[PDB]
Amino acid sequence: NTASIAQARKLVEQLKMEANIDRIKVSKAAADLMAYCEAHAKEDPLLTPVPASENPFRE
Amino acid sequence: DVQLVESGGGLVQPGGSRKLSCSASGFAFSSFGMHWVRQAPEKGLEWVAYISSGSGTIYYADTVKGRFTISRDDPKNTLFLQMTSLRSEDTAMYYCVRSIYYYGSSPFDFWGQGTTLTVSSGGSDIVMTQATSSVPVTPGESVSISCRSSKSLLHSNGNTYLYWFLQRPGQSPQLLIYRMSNLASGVPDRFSGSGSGTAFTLTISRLEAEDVGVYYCMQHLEYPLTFGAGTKLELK
Amino acid sequence: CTLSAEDKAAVERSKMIDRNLREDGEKARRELKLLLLGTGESGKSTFIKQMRIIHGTGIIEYPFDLENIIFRMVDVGGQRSERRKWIHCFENVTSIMFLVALSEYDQVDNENRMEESKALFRTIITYPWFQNSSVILFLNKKDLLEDKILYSHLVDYFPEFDGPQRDAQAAREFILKMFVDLNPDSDKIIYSHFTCATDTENIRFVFAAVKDTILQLNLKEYNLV
Amino acid sequence: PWQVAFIGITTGLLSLATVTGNLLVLISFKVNTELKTVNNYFLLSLACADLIIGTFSMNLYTTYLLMGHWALGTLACDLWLALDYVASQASVMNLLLISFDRYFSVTRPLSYRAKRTPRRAALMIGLAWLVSFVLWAPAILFWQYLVGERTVLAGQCYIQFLSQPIITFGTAMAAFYLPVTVMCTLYWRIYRETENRARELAALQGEKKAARTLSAILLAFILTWTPYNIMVLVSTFCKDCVPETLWELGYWLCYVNSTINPMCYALCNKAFRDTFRLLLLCRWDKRRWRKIP
Amino acid sequence: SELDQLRQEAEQLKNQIRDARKACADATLSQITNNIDPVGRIQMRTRRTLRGHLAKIYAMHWGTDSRLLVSASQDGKLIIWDSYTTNKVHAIPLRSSWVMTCAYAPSGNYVACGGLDNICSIYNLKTREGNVRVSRELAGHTGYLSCCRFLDDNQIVTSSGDTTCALWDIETGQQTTTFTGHTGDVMSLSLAPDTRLFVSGACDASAKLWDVREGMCRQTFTGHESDINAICFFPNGNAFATGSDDATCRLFDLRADQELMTYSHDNIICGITSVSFSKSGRLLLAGYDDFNCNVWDALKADRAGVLAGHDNRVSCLGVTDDGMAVATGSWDSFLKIWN
Ligand SMILES: CC(C)CCC[C@@H](C)[C@H]1CC[C@H]2[C@@H]3CC=C4C[C@@H](OC(=O)CCC(=O)O)CC[C@]4(C)[C@H]3CC[C@]12C
Ligand SMILES: CC(C)CCC[C@@H](C)[C@H]1CC[C@H]2[C@@H]3CC=C4C[C@@H](OC(=O)CCC(=O)O)CC[C@]4(C)[C@H]3CC[C@]12C
Ligand SMILES: C[N+](C)(C)CC#CCOC1=NOCC1
Fold it and tell me: Which parts of the sequence are annotated with region: G4 motif (chain C)?
């Protein structure tokens, strides 16, 4: 109520420290996200169908 | 904590009958499969009987398949073994050992103290052999114990059902490792078992005077559960 | 079979686990669930204490053993959370036990909390998680209602009441009608009781109401409603 | 020439109707889950017996009347008559079990909802089938091995021990008439119970459909099953005092019971009726039900 | 008069972060991945069905050994399954029947569950006495707790309904780091693969990020219209996907601080109940309320296939720690393992 300055100062304080983050730009973050997704794409059993000899859910 | 104490030993007449009772105190008795094993008073130990959880499945050794009977009492928390046609080959020390089977459990983890039934007047299975009976080594050396099988213990699911047991002189046996790779909860981590198919080696590194006793390999691929002859590690 | 000696005991353990799961499922199918919910300082504590004394932080579950049948009345009023998210936990409760106090007209933000309990009642029974359930409605504090209606007035706080200025019977049947004609748009019986602080047997009423609920579901199943 | 074609096509569309109704009840019990409750279990058994009569009896029986002589072998006729009679008696005992289940779930609803586990309902259904099995199937198969007399002819086949009057009197009493009187007693008690509940429904808070559907079920079953038993109880005293066109119609009224029996028990439950509607051209899907956020 | 200046300063800072984030945006993820090939229609199938539960299943969580899994349902029983052989390794009768979350420790020894009781109970599986016995219960929340996550074997983050995630200490039973700062009831949380900073989603369309070491909030994401009730990190920890109550999943990024793609079709109108990733992160997996899961292409933004076979809605979804299979636990009392 009359002590609104405490939670308002905490809101603006957390918001103003959220204003200070090194934002690496989007075209690079998508680039190394896609690079990680391609670099581990060989070892994913769900993209390509796995043969039933290496599948432990065969029977 | 966990307690397994049995009664019903002593001296009786041959040919007669005798009952045996291990009461369990300290754990959930209705959820554990139970086993009776016996040890000849100068030879190694052998397995005689097994009862499942809730008395669903009962297996007997073919030596005593017919003149022995097993039963339990889950409310009164006891396990009975009754023996008729009492020979002199049943002269042994009797151990009551609990065992639970889910994925990744430790069967044969706790063994009772044992009674002694002393009296006087291996076909179509896997035999677990070990051709060494005395390895006395000073403390501070790596000791390798071997054990040979008749068939490959490696089942289709990938497990290798070999169990190692230590027995200190003067007390009950202790489970060291189970499925020939995995250590029990309570043992020091210097033991290490390994092998493949038929080669089965238990290696102890940095030994002291607490690992002296007899060592038994044991198989669990099929019934009957046949033990090994033993291997003693003495002092110098 | 090609299972191990250790693997077959795991299947026997799994079947014993199945046995205990079915023996608990056909034991928790036996007692009847009742979602009690009531706000606005409606005397829910003395309500439950009255039922439990005549009978013999988090969510609370009360048991009841009457006529050799057993009820579980789940009280949930210690939640400071949004009820839009945890109400699907009761997608098939047998009945919602509402508790509204009779006297909380002209009790005030600026709104009378009888209107707030009307809004809560409507937004609960219009949920799609309560088709197969009934709405057992309770109205508490009869004597405080009759004292407040011999003392104060009702026609100014609720303009639609056209009745005697000292009446209690027509007043409580008017606000019972006001609760009823929220119209859950599928027509369905809404049971009702007029309790008080010293009402001895309302457990008998909730017994008869869930009995008529189960019987009504069976009759509509057999097309002989 | 043409009259046998007319009776063949009306029996063919009747057979199509009963197999359609009963396999659609079975299919709707498989493809739905709001009606997989313990009640419709009973109806599922009623969908099974009326299926057998639907697909093994009627067509076979009309190949009797299409040909005039049953020309497929004596053990074949004994097994066919045993199958027909065990399926008919099992359907009647299923109606009795449905009647007892409705009387208990209407008269004392709480404790009977507590006491009927699905295992107990399954063993009740098994009892209602095996009483029919041990009542009809030994006598038909074993009367010619008891008395040693194959007194039936070569061209005709029928139930053999009709001639002994007191055993068929007791058989039709414990097979038909006692189920009929207990079903009518229980359904009248159900109707009295709902007309009593309509008074107390006003005591809680604060066209008649029960009479229509109960009269439909009871009058349907009586009108379709009493001629065969009445004609049996006079043919076990007479010889040829009752004609044979009444005999074939008295057999076929039990088959029209089997074809109208879904429409008196399944379509009374509305969810069955919605699945029956949604099984046009196989347009049924669980995800096709609308939902809100 | 100070509260007016503080509110307008807060809205000015919100505008500053918004238009500084707009200048941080070079392009979108749909623009970059026009040069990669799609996966095509994949057909995953049911390998196991796990019929043990009686009420509706609310939560499951795979084991770190990728073989067992814990499931929790409203009958009041956790059951631990060996998913290879479909046996029930364990059956844990709970103290309260209203369990809305469960989690399996990455050490294997412990399990935890919670829900409408506002208590997070923690059971010790590998016990010397044979049975699964409750180690201890954590009672410091006021609302219902909606998610549990073991980070190591002695501390656990518990999202709740009082707009508060926490961080506990199981050796003492008291919480150490209360993560205040949400405005809606906190619906889900996801731990990092490196496990030093978790993400959290609530009933205010806001996916706030925290670290477990200090106790402060790091970033705050807002791109949803309605309630968000599912969240899941990327396999590396530099992104996370979000599933909200308006049939939209969207992928936020940690360093870029924006959204990159969103996932929506017109026929899909019902909200997401759970979301998860693959081990390579090419496929997002979303369990909707139209009873079907969807495998979303996480780069080309389309759906790579459906998963049908549940009569009721899919309330929990999980992918193993090695990516061999996918469990779906649903309200029709069934789990289904898929590949
Ligand atoms: C095909 C002809 C020649 C033989 C007659 C068949 C009957 C003996 C069968 C057909 C349909 C069966 C019923 C189909 C469905 C059920 C529900 C089912 O109820 C349970 O007890 C379920 C148990 C479980 O879930 O495993 C099993 C009994 C019952 C009544 C069955 C009892 C046996 C019936 C009547
Ligand atoms: C083949 C023809 C000649 C008879 C076929 C049967 C029906 C015509 C009759 C025979 C027995 C009658 C039933 C005998 C007794 C009763 C109980 C009666 O209910 C009571 O008054 C209470 C019953 C009791 O006193 O125990 C209602 C009619 C009903 C079902 C009757 C309905 C008509 C039934 C079924
Ligand atoms: C002859 N048909 C098999 C076509 C109907 C019949 C019969 C006998 O079964 C019953 N006895 O009483 C009730 C039904």
Answer: 136-143
